Write an enzyme that holds these catalytic residues in place. Structure first.
Site, PDB file in Angstrom:
ATOM      1  N   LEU J  42       0.103  10.769  10.052  1.00 37.32           N
ATOM      2  CA  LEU J  42      -0.974  10.508   9.112  1.00 37.32           C
ATOM      3  C   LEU J  42      -0.635  11.097   7.750  1.00 37.32           C
ATOM      4  O   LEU J  42       0.403  11.733   7.556  1.00 37.32           O
ATOM      5  CB  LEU J  42      -2.298  11.087   9.622  1.00 37.32           C
ATOM      6  CG  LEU J  42      -2.828  10.622  10.984  1.00 37.32           C
ATOM      7  CD1 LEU J  42      -4.337  10.788  11.052  1.00 37.32           C
ATOM      8  CD2 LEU J  42      -2.448   9.186  11.288  1.00 37.32           C
ATOM      9  N   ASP J  43      -1.533  10.873   6.799  1.00 40.77           N
ATOM     10  CA  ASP J  43      -1.378  11.365   5.442  1.00 40.77           C
ATOM     11  C   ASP J  43      -2.463  12.382   5.119  1.00 40.77           C
ATOM     12  O   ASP J  43      -3.539  12.404   5.727  1.00 40.77           O
ATOM     13  CB  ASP J  43      -1.429  10.215   4.433  1.00 40.77           C
ATOM     14  CG  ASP J  43      -0.472   9.094   4.777  1.00 40.77           C
ATOM     15  OD1 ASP J  43      -0.569   8.016   4.152  1.00 40.77           O
ATOM     16  OD2 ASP J  43       0.375   9.288   5.673  1.00 40.77           O
ATOM     17  N   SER J  44      -2.152  13.237   4.146  1.00 41.81           N
ATOM     18  CA  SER J  44      -3.118  14.229   3.690  1.00 41.81           C
ATOM     19  C   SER J  44      -4.406  13.565   3.218  1.00 41.81           C
ATOM     20  O   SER J  44      -5.505  14.073   3.471  1.00 41.81           O
ATOM     21  CB  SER J  44      -2.503  15.067   2.572  1.00 41.81           C
ATOM     22  OG  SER J  44      -1.862  14.244   1.613  1.00 41.81           O
TER      23      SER J  44
END
Ligand SMILES: CCCCCCCCCCCCCCCCCC(=O)OC[C@H](COP(=O)([O-])OCC(O)COP(=O)([O-])OC[C@@H](COC(=O)CCCCCCCCCCCCCCCCC)OC(=O)CCCCCCCCCCCCCCCCC)OC(=O)CCCCCCCCCCCCCCCCC
Ligand SMILES: CCCCCCCCCCCCCCCCCC(=O)OC[C@H](COP(=O)(O)OCCN)OC(=O)CCCCCCCCCCCCCCCCC
Ligand SMILES: CCCCCCCCCCCCCCCCCC(=O)OC[C@H](COP(=O)(O)OCCN)OC(=O)CCCCCCCCCCCCCCCCC
Lengths: 62, 168, 63, 176, 114, 48, 125, 156, 459, 88, 151, 61, 102
Positions: J42-44
């Protein structure tokens, strides 16, 4: 009482019919005293347009 | 309750003209009140007054004999000065209470006359202005250490001024 | 705090209520008195120029 | 609000916080959640555009222009969260959030009732003094003479024994 | 209306409300008439009225208050009285309109004289 | 109790009584309720 | 746009002196952190210190009170603008109020000597 | 317990004294900076940023949660007005100059228009209400022995 | 009057010889009996003042102070019964003896006629206060505080005495009401002006103005509960009573010998009320409030109007009681903590639920919440000052506002925040201190009810 | 009008409900310890939006100090439990 | 308001009463608001009142309806933007009866008093329609404008 | 039942005490109570002697 | 002319009564909120009577219950002025406060 989650709850008839009671009652009273006092917003009296009077009265010298 | 002191003007009561087809509530309301409340209260009052009358007691009013005044009072001597100054304090207090009486009668007259206070409530105002000119010319600028001596100096200075005016 | 409240209410009521009751009984039985004018044969005493019975009682006994 | 922060920060957290702040202010501006989602996706695209870039120059420039745009287009009256600062419940219950040590001064006529609970306080405090001194050496042994420390707290490297400094956290009253 | 007629249009003829008798009272009436009161000081006093309340329209109001007190709980029984009272106040406000217009026309006359 | 049942503290009652009586007296006899000169200006004597 | 003020300071982010990446400045920050952590740990070794029957002493608070209360006159050195502000606060306003009151009283006195000022009802004073 | 060495003193004119003062107040030298020397009594109590206490990190569980101040963290000389129940330097999206300008402009406009409307008022195109008995010259006190101007009111 | 004094002169040997386990209770209860018997003076049926000999007398302006003193004695006792608990029986007995000597002196002076007797007693008041303050304080500057106290007072004392001599010689006697019945008027020259000074300067130095308010805070701070009580309650009132009784002669000088003092009093009221906002030390705040109110007292005393004198007496009594009460509360919060500072202990009312209502009921009486003798006095004095000039309501109002402010600041930095977590030394309220609060309060209620007693000369 | 308190089963079911209604990367099958950046790539941005959605779901707010460090649903639940003091 | 909606459906009673109050404050012709507000708005234009004062007063009479319909829209007509959980309960009498009594009062007492009190002052019942119905017209204007903007 | 007991203990007793107070300590004093004068009208008779009173003149229209 | 003052003092006496109860020890046994609500209801029902008598007589009233002091020609006393304004405001305030208390 028993909560719900992201759904609409099953409501009782008492509260909703009391709300309907209040609102219908307001409408009824408004219509009643509107019928009876339609002039309280207009007035039974006629405001005059000057230039309709006559120098005849309120005597003036020409 | 000296009524000659407190007038209590008459009471031109009106009459009832209940022209309708509905009953006055106040009738039954006040009837039931005067029935249930006043009955026991009145009986108890009679009981109390009877006990009073059976063990009655009296008390008089203190009459302070008069004495000489500051005028006929040699300076340096004191006894006279004291027996005069205390009499004067009594008179001062009595005049203050008179002022209170006037003001009370005035407020009464005012309310009892209602909105017509500007016409029928003008008599008492004149007594007030007069009494107040008196109380002013007597006890205006003495000081918390007021006394017959200072009041007399006031009176005397005022007399001298009036007399100079008269003579010119 | 409950203790302070209760004990203060006690050590007040204890003598406040008996006293107030005596006062009520006095006002009822004895009650106040009349403004009898001064006869020309009697020289009233300091315990008779005052109205309330308690007041005149003290003025007669102590002062 | 339990763990503490570091002295300095990083571009990462700065940008994250700007993001969250802007999204909250947008939820506040544009009420309907549909519009909120729309503009939030737009902001996400705006970010992902420059995401992969790494040059500190462009980083600082964009960040300091972003903060100015944010402060100049923010919501005057934002959406505060009740249970957090600014709201209408912050500390509302602190007037009722009493600590425990008020207990000791109870009267025996009162702790007469509630007997069970006071039957367990002792075995709790007993769970404190018996394991206090140890919680000190764990630090006074590991109080690295280097003398450059943070506010973090190490656990009980042993088993059975308890951690250090658990009193000021445990026993913290409820929120109610 | 007269407001702008006074402020941005002609600036003096528009009369002043607070000096109406500035003109003689019979400049166009041969032996002008006067008014009449239908309630005496004594009555308008004993009825305990107010000063912004007692005008030439006082008898309608006295009868109104009588019919209002009498049959009090059966209120709403004094309405042919309120109608007449408002009628009288309408008449009075009309008289005042007419006096203002009179002064307007007389100023018109004066300025026509120059 | 003592205090509340103290009598006529500094005469604020006897004085009311006395004022009532004096006002009756003077209202009847026609005198004014308060003369603007207290001491008899006759017994007094002044310079020129 | 925005400007600073003595009330509304320049908020955290916008501050140009922040976002700096100086190793010396970051080291100063970390030194502040070491300090603050030592303080909080010394404080927590007492907040929970059992066998305690007392409270904590706040020496910062005590020193602040000392400096506001009693360390003043010793370290006080008179100079101008200071003597000046003092003489001002001690003389000026008193004298202004005084001229005001004296003028008012003389007005009242001459008015009365003329015998004009309506004093009706000023029976109690 | 306290002691002179732990308490304040005079204005340190030498880094020798400055550094000891800082390690006493539990600060760092390069940040320590006392007040100027005008002999008002400041002495050597640090000069700190003129910031309020609504600014401080509100999340960290401070020991003095009502002041957001830690144990030995030096205390701003003027805390009494920054106790957070008082003056708030919480920055504003809008700015000082612009807000003051807005307010003063609005208020000036309002008062100016109020004077304008008082000088050029509104009124209904009629005359003054009449009154029967010489404007009730009696009920306004008047007197029973004076016949002033006979105020006769006519019909139109 | 001996009926009031002699027993107060017997409490001393009583204390000396009574056993430790019983001296406290015995002396306390008997001092309460004395307070009771001290009400005979209130049988002032008629206006003829009370005179018992050529050496004593009473009056409506003095009786209140007498009763208040005879009733503040036992409160000092009680409030002085938890500290010095580890001090020897002999020492606490000395303390009791000093308190009782203060009581006796104050009674004799508030009763005496001859101002010279008044003066010797007014100056003998010192020794017990100086002692109580030096030998039982809790700090070190108590020494300088006592020195200031003593020397301010004696500097005042001296020219007062010299003027009393000039009087006793020019006039024949010094007895009061003779000074009245044989007063006169002065040519109003620099001589008589400096005489006015040498007569009022001491009473003023005692009842502090702006210029000489300095010895009050040091005293009320370094000194213990009893010294603080008695200062804030009476040792100020002595100056006011002396000024009232003595100004009877100096007419007319006090018309133009007042402007500077009135100005100073008002400005000082204002500046001190302001400092009460930012004064950390609680007792110092209370002391400066006392200054702010005694300034009103002085401004009302000078101009010599009856309304003004009655307001002065009302506010005098009210402030006496209220300040004693506030100081009890401060001491209370101190014995548990041992730090006067206001901002250290905070967010109470969660563990002292009741005490607050003894904090509140004080502030409301400080900020002049009615119906209270406090506001009655403030208001009558403002009336007199408005008559004396129309441009003083300004200062009256500024003071009222700043008071309404700092009273609540004090309430809110000690009973409105959130509770600390390291004040484990919060021994709950003692019935004793609760009793002291109730006893300081209740009389305020009864006097708010029937104040005719507490009016003054003019009523 | 106070509803009942929150329990661990309810919290967990809710969190799974929300992280499943999520659409970006979650393959509709989340392990309680389905690490976002590691175990789901996932991404921040996504993680922060998750935290925000949870804030909205439970009314209160999660501070940044811990939002940046939460990397496990179990950790989110432990945090909520230590904040609301659940499971007497 | 920013986190509430659908209040009508989810809670009819409070919404009905809130609408009653909102319209009464707007100046609905016979809901005990009229019987004072409209006489006041008569006198304000009928007497020698300062221009700017009159003007801002009428502007405010409009802004009444403005923010009333603001309440209405943001709370009672848009979507349920509030959290998912729900524990509503209003069937309790101690909370359903008071509002009922107060609504009856707010609907009747104004009329009752306006017809029962002694007629203190002398009114003015002679003016044009555009000065007798100004409050009504301008409140309707406020309604329309608030609808347009909220939409 | 409790309804009647409350009515009693919180309306009646105070009403008795207060009627005593009023009618034997307040109306027994000069100007304690001030009954504003009633509002007579024309025609209205009087429960005292108060002979009949006159109406006004013409009521045209 | 006795029922009027009776009511006007009875309303204050009712409102007092709870406060007095607050001093006492019953609260821990009793439903103080309902107690106070119902006392307020009866205070309102009382206050109503003045309205009827006032609309039926339009007679204002003025009272001086208790004489406090006599401060040398400026007395003081607990004086009430039951006229339209207050005799109506009492009823309105109670009609609201009963509901608020529930
Ligand atoms: C005159 C006209 C002016 C009216 C304006 C009054 C302002 C009101 C100020 C105020 O609220 O005072 C707080 C006070 C109550 O404070 P509180 O914090 O709510 O009391 C709770 C107790 O801590 C805990 O409750 P409690 O168990 O102590 O209750 C029993 C009661 C017991 O009181 C007694 O029995 C003492 C009797 C003497 O004790 C008290 O409540 C406090 C005394 O108000 C009162 O109820 C006292 C009577 C109010 C009448 C006026 C009293 C003078 C002021
Ligand atoms: C016609 C009359 C014209 C007067 C025009 C001026 C009137 C406005 C001035 C009133 C001063 C108000 C002071 C005040 O209330 O301050 C409140 C302040 C907090 O206010 P807030 O914005 O809510 O911030 C909360 C964030 N924590 O925090 C505080 O608690 C304030 C602390 C009080 C400090 C003492 C102030 C002394 C009194 C100032 C007098 C000046 C005004 C003179 C008015 C004339
Ligand atoms: C000098 C005082 C300062 C010293 C403080 C220390 C005091 C200790 C000494 C003993 C206590 C002080 C004595 C106070 C006396 C109380 C007086 C009193 O009870 O009030 C009397 C009052 C009657 O009212 P009254 O003012 O007398 O006359 C007006 C007509 N109603 O009747 C009442 O209604 C009283 C109400 C009681 C409840």
């Amino acid at each position: 009482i028993q909560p719900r989650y992201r759904e609409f709850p099953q409501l009782t008839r008492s509260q909703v019919i009391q709300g309907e009671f209040l609102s219908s009652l307001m409408w009824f009273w408004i219509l009643w005293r509107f019928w009876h006092d339609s002039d309280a917003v207009l007035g039974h009296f006629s405001y005059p347009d000057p230039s309709q009077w006559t120098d005849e009265e309120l005597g003036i010298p020409p | 309750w000296d009524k000659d002191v407190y007038p209590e003007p008459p009471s031109r009561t009106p009459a009832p003209s209940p022209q309708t087809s509905l009953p006055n509530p106040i009738t039954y309301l006040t009837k039931a009140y005067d029935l249930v409340v006043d009955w026991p209260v009145t009986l108890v009052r009679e009981f109390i007054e009877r006990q009073h009358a059976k063990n009655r007691t009296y008390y008089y009013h203190r009459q302070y004999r008069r004495v000489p005044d500051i005028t006929e009072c040699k300076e340096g001597d004191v006894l006279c000065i004291y027996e005069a100054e205390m009499q004067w304090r009594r008179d001062f207090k009595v005049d203050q209470e008179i002022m209170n009486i006037i003001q009370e009668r005035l407020k009464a007259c005012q309310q009892r006359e209602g909105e017509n206070y500007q016409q029928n409530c003008a008599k008492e105002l004149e007594q007030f202005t007069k009494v107040t000119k008196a109380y002013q010319d007597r006890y205006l600028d003495l000081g918390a250490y007021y006394s017959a001596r200072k009041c007399l100096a006031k009176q005397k200075q005022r007399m001298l001024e009036e007399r100079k005016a008269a003579r010119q | 705090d409950a203790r302070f409240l209760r004990l203060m209410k006690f050590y007040l009521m204890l003598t406040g209520i008996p006293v107030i009751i005596g006062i009520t009984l006095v006002n009822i039985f004895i009650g106040e008195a009349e403004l009898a004018e001064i006869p020309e044969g009697y020289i009233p005493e300091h315990w008779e120029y005052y109205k309330h019975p308690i007041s005149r009682w003290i003025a007669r006994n102590f002062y | 609000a339990f763990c503490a922060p570091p002295a300095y920060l990083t571009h990462q957290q700065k940008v994250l916080r700007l993001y969250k702040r802007a999204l909250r202010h947008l939820e506040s501006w544009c009420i309907h959640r549909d519009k909120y989602r729309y503009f939030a996706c737009l902001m996400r695209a705006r970010f992902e555009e420059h995401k992969n870039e790494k040059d500190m120059m462009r980083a600082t420039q964009l960040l300091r222009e972003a903060e100015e745009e944010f402060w100049q287009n923010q919501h005057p009256q934002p959406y505060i969260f009740p249970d957090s600062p600014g709201g209408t419940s912050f500390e509302r219950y602190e007037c009722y959030k009493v600590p425990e040590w008020c207990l000791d001064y109870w009267h025996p006529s009162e702790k007469a009732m509630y007997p069970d609970y006071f039957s367990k306080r002792e075995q709790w405090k007993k769970l404190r003094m018996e394991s206090w001194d140890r919680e000190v050496k764990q630090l006074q042994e590991e109080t690295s003479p280097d003398g450059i420390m943070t506010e973090a707290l190490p656990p009980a490297r042993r088993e059975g024994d308890l951690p250090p400094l658990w009193w000021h956290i445990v026993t913290r009253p409820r929120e109610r | 209306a007269h407001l702008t007629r006074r402020y941005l249009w002609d600036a003096s003829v528009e009369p002043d409300p607070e000096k109406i008798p500035s003109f003689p009272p019979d400049l166009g009436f041969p032996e002008r008439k006067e008014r009449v009161m239908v309630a005496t000081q004594q009555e308008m006093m004993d009825a305990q009225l107010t000063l912004q309340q007692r005008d030439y329209c006082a008898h309608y109001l006295i009868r109104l208050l009588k019919c209002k007190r009498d049959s009090f709980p059966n209120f709403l029984a004094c309405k042919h009285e309120q109608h007449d009272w408002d009628y009288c106040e309408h008449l009075d406000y009309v008289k005042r309109m007419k006096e203002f217009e009179r002064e307007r026309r007389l100023l018109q006359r004066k300025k026509r004289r120059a | 109790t003592f205090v509340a049942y103290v009598p006529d503290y500094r005469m604020q009652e006897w004085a009311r009584r006395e004022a009532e009586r004096l006002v009756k007296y003077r209202e009847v006899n026609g005198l004014p309720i308060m003369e603007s000169n207290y001491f008899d200006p006759s017994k007094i004597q002044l310079p020129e | 746009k925005y400007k600073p003020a003595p009330l509304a300071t320049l908020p955290s982010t916008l501050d140009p002196a922040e976002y700096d990446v100086s190793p010396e400045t970051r080291r100063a920050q970390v030194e502040r952190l070491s300090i603050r952590a030592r303080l909080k740990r010394e404080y927590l070794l007492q907040y929970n210190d059992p066998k305690r029957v007392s409270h904590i002493e706040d020496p910062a608070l005590i020193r602040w009170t000392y400096a506001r209360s009693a360390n003043i006159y010793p370290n006080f050195r008179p100079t101008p603008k200071n003597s000046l502000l003092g003489a001002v606060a001690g003389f000026g306003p008193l004298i202004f109020w005084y001229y005001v009151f004296k003028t008012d009283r003389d007005r009242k006195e001459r008015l009365i000597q003329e015998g004009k000022l309506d004093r009706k009802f000023n029976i109690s004073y | 317990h306290m002691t002179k060495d732990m308490l304040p003193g005079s204005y340190p004119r030498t880094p020798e004294e400055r550094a000891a003062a800082a390690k006493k107040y539990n600060m760092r030298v390069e940040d320590y900076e006392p007040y100027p020397d005008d002999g008002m009594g400041y002495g050597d109590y640090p000069m700190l940023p003129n910031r309020s206490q609504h600014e401080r990190d509100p999340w960290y569980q401070w020991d003095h949660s009502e002041l957001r101040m830690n144990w030995g963290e030096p205390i701003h000389w003027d805390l009494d007005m920054y106790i957070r129940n008082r003056v708030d330097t919480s920055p504003t999206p809008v700015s000082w100059d612009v807000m003051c300008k807005h307010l003063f402009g609005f208020v000036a406009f309002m008062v100016f228009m109020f004077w304008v409307g008082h000088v050029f008022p509104s009124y209904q195109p009629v005359g003054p209400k009449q009154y029967p008995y010489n404007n009730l010259y009696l009920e306004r006190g008047g007197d029973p022995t004076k016949e002033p101007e006979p105020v006769v009111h006519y019909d139109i | 009057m001996l009926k009031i004094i002699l027993p107060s002169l017997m409490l001393l040997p009583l204390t000396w010889l009574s056993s430790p386990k019983k001296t406290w209770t015995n002396v306390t209860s008997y001092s309460f009996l004395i307070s009771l018997t001290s009400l005979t003076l209130l049988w002032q049926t008629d206006e003829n003042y009370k005179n018992f000999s050529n050496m004593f007398s009473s009056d409506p302006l003095s009786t209140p102070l007498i009763i208040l003193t005879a009733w503040l004695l036992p409160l000092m006792l009680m409030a002085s019964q938890n500290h010095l608990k580890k001090d020897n029986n002999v020492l606490q007995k000395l303390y009791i003896s000093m308190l009782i000597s203060l009581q006796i002196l104050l009674i004799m002076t508030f009763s005496a006629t001859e101002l010279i007797m008044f003066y010797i007693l007014f100056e003998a008041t010192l020794i017990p206060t100086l002692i109580i303050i030096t030998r039982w304080g809790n700090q070190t500057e108590r020494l300088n505080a006592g020195i200031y106290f003593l020397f301010y007072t004696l500097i005042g004392s001296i020219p007062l005495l010299i003027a009393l001599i000039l009087i006793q010689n020019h006039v024949g006697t010094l007895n009061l009401m003779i000074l009245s019945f044989t007063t006169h008027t002065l040519d109003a020259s620099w001589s008589n002006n400096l005489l006015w000074l040498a007569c009022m300067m001491a009473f003023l130095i005692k009842m502090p103005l702006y210029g000489v308010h300095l010895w009050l805070p040091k005293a009320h701070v370094e000194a213990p509960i009893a010294g603080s009580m008695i200062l804030a309650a009476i040792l100020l009132k002595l100056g006011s009573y002396g000024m009232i009784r003595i100004s009877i002669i100096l007419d007319p000088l006090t018309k133009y010998m007042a402007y500077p003092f009135i100005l100073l009093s008002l400005w000082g009221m204002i500046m001190t009320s302001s400092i009460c906002l930012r004064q950390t030390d609680l007792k110092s705040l209370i002391a400066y409030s006392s200054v702010s109110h005694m300034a009103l007292v002085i401004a009302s005393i000078m101009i010599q109007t009856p309304w003004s004198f009655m307001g002065a007496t009302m506010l005098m009594i009210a402030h006496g009681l209220t300040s004693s009460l506030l100081f009890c509360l401060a001491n209370s919060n101190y014995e548990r903590i041992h730090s006067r500072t206001m901002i250290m202990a905070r967010g109470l009312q969660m563990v002292f639920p009741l005490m607050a209502t003894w904090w509140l009921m004080a502030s409301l009486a400080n900020l002049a919440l009615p119906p209270s003798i406090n506001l009655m006095g403030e208001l009558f004095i403002t009336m007199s000052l408005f008559s004396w000039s129309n441009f003083t309501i300004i200062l009256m109002g500024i003071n009222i506002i700043i008071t309404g402010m700092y009273s609540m600041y004090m309430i809110i930095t000690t009973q409105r925040g959130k509770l600390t977590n390291h004040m484990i030394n919060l021994q709950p309220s003692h019935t004793r201190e609760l009793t002291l609060m109730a006893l300081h309060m209740i009389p305020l209620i009864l006097l708010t009810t029937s104040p005719k007693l507490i009016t003054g000369l003019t009523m | 009008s106070d509803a009942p308190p929150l329990t661990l089963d309810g919290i967990k079911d809710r969190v799974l409900y929300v992280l499943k209604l999520y659409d970006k990367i979650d393959p509709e099958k989340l392990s309680v310890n389905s690490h976002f950046m590691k175990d789901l790539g996932l991404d921040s941005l996504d993680q922060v939006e998750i935290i925000m959605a949870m804030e909205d779901e439970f009314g209160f707010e999660i501070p940044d100090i811990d939002a940046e460090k939460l990397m496990c649903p179990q950790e989110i639940v432990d945090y909520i439990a230590d904040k609301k003091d659940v499971y007497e | 308001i920013r986190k509430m909606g659908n209040i009508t459906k989810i809670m009819p009673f409070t919404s009905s009463c809130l609408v009653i109050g909102s319209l009464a404050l707007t100046g609905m012709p016979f809901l005990t608001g009229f019987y004072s507000k409209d006489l006041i708005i008569e006198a304000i234009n009928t007497c020698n009142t300062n221009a700017w004062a009159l003007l801002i007063t009428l502007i405010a009479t409009s802004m009444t309806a403005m923010y009333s319909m603001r309440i209405i829209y943001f709370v009672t007509m848009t979507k349920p933007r509030f959290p998912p959980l729900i524990s509503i309960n209003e069937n309790d009498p101690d909370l359903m009866n008071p509002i009922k009594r107060l609504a009856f009062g707010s609907i009747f007492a104004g009329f009752v008093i306006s017809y029962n009190i002694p007629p203190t002052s002398i009114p003015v019942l002679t003016m044009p329609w555009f000065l007798k119905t100004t409050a009504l017209i301008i409140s309707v204007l406020g309604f329309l404008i608030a609808l347009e903007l909220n939409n | 039942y409790r309804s009647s007991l409350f009515a009693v203990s919180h309306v009646l007793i105070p009403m008795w005490f207060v009627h005593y107070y009023v009618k034997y300590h307040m109306a027994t004093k000069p100007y304690t109570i001030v009954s504003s004068k009633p509002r007579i009208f024309p025609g209205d008779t009087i429960l005292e002697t108060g002979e009949v009173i006159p109406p006004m003149r013409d009521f045209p229209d | 002319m006795n029922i009027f003052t009776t009511s006007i003092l009875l309303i204050f006496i009712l409102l007092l009564s709870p406060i007095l109860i607050s001093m006492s020890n019953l609260i821990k046994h009793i439903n103080f909120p309902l107690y106070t609500t119902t006392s307020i209801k009866f205070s309102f029902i009382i206050s109503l009577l003045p309205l009827l008598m006032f609309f039926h007589n339009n007679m204002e009233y003025m009272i001086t219950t208790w004489h406090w002091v006599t401060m040398n020609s400026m007395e003081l006393k607990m004086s009430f002025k039951t006229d339209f304004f207050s005799i109506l405001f009492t009823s309105v305030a109670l009609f609201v406060t009963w509901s608020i208390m529930q």
